[PDB]
Amino acid sequence: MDSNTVSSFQVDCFLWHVRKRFADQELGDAPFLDRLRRDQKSLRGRGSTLGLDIETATRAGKQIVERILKEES
Amino acid sequence: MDSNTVSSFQVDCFLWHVRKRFADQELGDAPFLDRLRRDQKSLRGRGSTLGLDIETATRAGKQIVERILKEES
């Protein structure tokens, strides 16, 4: 069973939704949309392998970013 | 003057500190440290060009991530 490859996929799903909340608001310049297209198909094709839905993983990792930083101390 | 290339650098400084708070806690497997080394020198060498300190940039981008999502509605 894979626990630390599923938490590094759930946090990358949240960090990509933080970057697609930045691109869909037109924050940054034009090369940020160039960088997004290449890695959007790469992050979602990595979802097929370990078998997790990207929208539910963007939400499950949200709790695992928020709570793991209030956890640290 | 560059405003949207400085906000995409301040958010990447915060998102890298979210990934270096993950690597320094031993969260994820060994290839996440392989991926980190390549881009750590790339993110900091990009700091030299636009001329912003990476610790202070990790810091007001935190306010620019937190506040821009409570700002969206």
- Residue B70 sits in a domain whose CATH number is 1.10.287.10
Structure determination technique employed: NMR
- Domain extent, residue B65, equals 1-73
Helix (H, G, I), strand (E, B) or coil at A3: coil
CA dist B68 and B73 (Å) reads 10
Q: Residue B60 contacts by C-beta under 8 Å, 6 or more apart in sequence?
A: B10
CA dist B6 and B1 (Å) reads 10
Of B55, B72, B22, B61, the residue nearest A7 (C-alpha) = B22
Record: contact A8-B27, CB cut-off 8 A: yes
Is A39 in CB contact (< 8 Å) with chain B? Answer: no
DSSP letter at B28?
A: S
- Asked if B11 and A22 count as a contact pair (C-beta separation under 8 A), the reply is yes
Which single residue is written with the structure tokens 């020198």? B41
Q: Residue A73 contacts by C-beta under 8 Å, 6 or more apart in sequence?
A: none
Closest approach of chain B CAs to the CA of A68, in angstroms? Answer: 9
| Structural domain total, chain B | 1
